Amino acid sequence: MDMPVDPNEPTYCLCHQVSYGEMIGCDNPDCSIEWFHFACVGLTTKPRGKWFCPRCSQERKKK
Ligand SMILES: [Zn+2]
Ligand SMILES: [Zn+2]
C-alpha cells in the first residue's frame, strides 16, 4: 500500500512529501507544516509578504 520511505526522510506540504521546485510557506508563528506547494493552494507564481495556507485562510469559503 502507498509509496512509503525511511524514517530518515523529511517532508514539507500537508501531503507529507520530500523536497520540490516551487514553494511557499505559511506566515503564522503557529503553523505546524510551515511549507506548501503552489498547487496545494492553486498558485501559478510566487507572492511575497503575509501568505496563509489552505487550512489557514482558504477554509473560510463555506467548506
Ligand atoms: Zn505538496
Ligand atoms: Zn500553514
Curated annotation (Swiss-Prot):
Zn(2+) 1 binds at C13, C15, H37, C40. Citrullination by PADI4 within the nuclear localization signal disrupts the interaction with p53 and increases susceptibility to degradation. The record marks Y12, M23, D27, W35 as: Histone H3K4me3 binding. A zinc finger (PHD-type) spans 10-59. It is found in: Nucleus. Zn(2+) 2 binds at C26, C31, C53, C56. Transmembrane segments: none annotated. It comes from the Eukaryota. The PHD-type zinc finger mediates the binding to H3K4me3. Component of HBO1 complexes, which specifically mediate acetylation of histone H3 at 'Lys-14' (H3K14ac), and have reduced activity toward histone H4. Through chromatin acetylation it may function in DNA replication. May inhibit tumor progression by modulating the transcriptional output of signaling pathways which regulate cell proliferation. Can suppress brain tumor angiogenesis through transcriptional repression of RELA/NFKB3 target genes when complexed with RELA. May also specifically suppress loss of contact inhibition elicited by activated oncogenes such as MYC. Belongs to the ING family. Homodimer. Component of the HBO1 complex composed of KAT7/HBO1, MEAF6, ING4 or ING5, and one scaffold subunit: complexes containing BRPF scaffold (BRPF1, BRD1/BRPF2 or BRPF3) direct KAT7/HBO1 specificity towards H3K14ac, while complexes containing JADE scaffold (JADE1, JADE2 and JADE3) mediate acetylation of histone H4. Interacts with H3K4me3 and to a lesser extent with H3K4me2, the interaction augments KAT7/HBO1 acetylation activity on H3 tails. Interacts with EP300, RELA and TP53; these interactions may be indirect. Interacts with EGLN1. Interacts with BCL2A1. This is Inhibitor of growth protein 4. It comes from Homo sapiens (Human).
